[PDB]
Amino acid sequence: PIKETDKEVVLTHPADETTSVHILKYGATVYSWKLKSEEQLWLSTAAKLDGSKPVRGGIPLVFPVFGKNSTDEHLSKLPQHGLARNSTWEFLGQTKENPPTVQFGLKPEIANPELTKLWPMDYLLILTVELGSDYLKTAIEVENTSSSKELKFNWLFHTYFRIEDIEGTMVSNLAGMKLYDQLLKESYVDKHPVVTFNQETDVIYQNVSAERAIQIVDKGVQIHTLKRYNLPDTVVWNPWIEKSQGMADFEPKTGYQQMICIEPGHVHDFISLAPGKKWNAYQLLCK
Ligand code: NA
Numbered sequence: 593p594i595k596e597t598d599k600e601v602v603l604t605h606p607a608d609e610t611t612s613v614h615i616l617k618y619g620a621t622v623y624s625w626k627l628k629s630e631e632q633l634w635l636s637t638a639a640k641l642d643g644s645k646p647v648r649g650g651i652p653l654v655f656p657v658f659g660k661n662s663t664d665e666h667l668s669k670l671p672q673h674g675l676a677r678n679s680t681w682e683f684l685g686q687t688k689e690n691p692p693t694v695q696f697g698l699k700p701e702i703a704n705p706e707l708t709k710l711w712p713m714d715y716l717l718i719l720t721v722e723l724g725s726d727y728l729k730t731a732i733e734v735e736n737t738s739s740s741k742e743l744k745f746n747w748l749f750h751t752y753f754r755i756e757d758i759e760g761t762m763v764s765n766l767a768g769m770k771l772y773d774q775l776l777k778e779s780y781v782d783k784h785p786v787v788t789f790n791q792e793t794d795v796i797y798q799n800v801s802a803e804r805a806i807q808i809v810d811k812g813v814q815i816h817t818l819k820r821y822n823l824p825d826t827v828v829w830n831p832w833i834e835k836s837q838g839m840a841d842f843e844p845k846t847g848y849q850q851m852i853c854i855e856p857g858h859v860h861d862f863i864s865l866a867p868g869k870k871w872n873a874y875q876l877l878c879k
Pocket of ligand 1: 638839840841842843
């Protein structure tokens, strides 16, 4: 079933109503995904769901810039992570009853007014959210609706996975991959067989294909699996103690212990889309 309210859309799986996803129209932000009653995403207890600022948790959408840009004339004018996550998307309706599937849209005319003036590029976004019995798929299509100008952008899904304890968690299937370390400001190959956590980390793994599933493991159990299509980068982020303290809408301050962000995207460089042309990708979350 699908249920629309003024602020959100909620999908429940027809075989089991305790499997659900809640999507805020603001940012088209998934902020809860329950699998048979069990919450799969981390959301700050102080997250704003009222459209006052981006949602701290769930799956914020990152477009058209990942991070803060300094050198592009127009992208450098935008705040960190762009304008998709602070614009109210239009619910386009349901496309399927089983698996329950819905679409959301954004275009300059309905996007964040201040930010649209800073970056007045033509585009159309369509987000498709599909709720399976044992997975969540979030797919994106971007269309360059200009007839003359190329459209230059990054795309990233800022997925916050919920875990029990970051220090006892590991992430597998990234051994031997190249990364850019945003904290150290250097690139290197990750030579370790798994990723483990003891401090702030902010790394961008590269060359991750549709064939390379990433697993999050706790007490020997794969508690989360992430697959993707057409998103060659993966950001791995945890704020740790100090950064968490500084984030006003991040609570509890120990909350970094129950989250890990593993964020598929195209962020190592910009996609340049010719006029009239389309680009598409998705991420797929399961257990
Ligand atoms: Na606070």
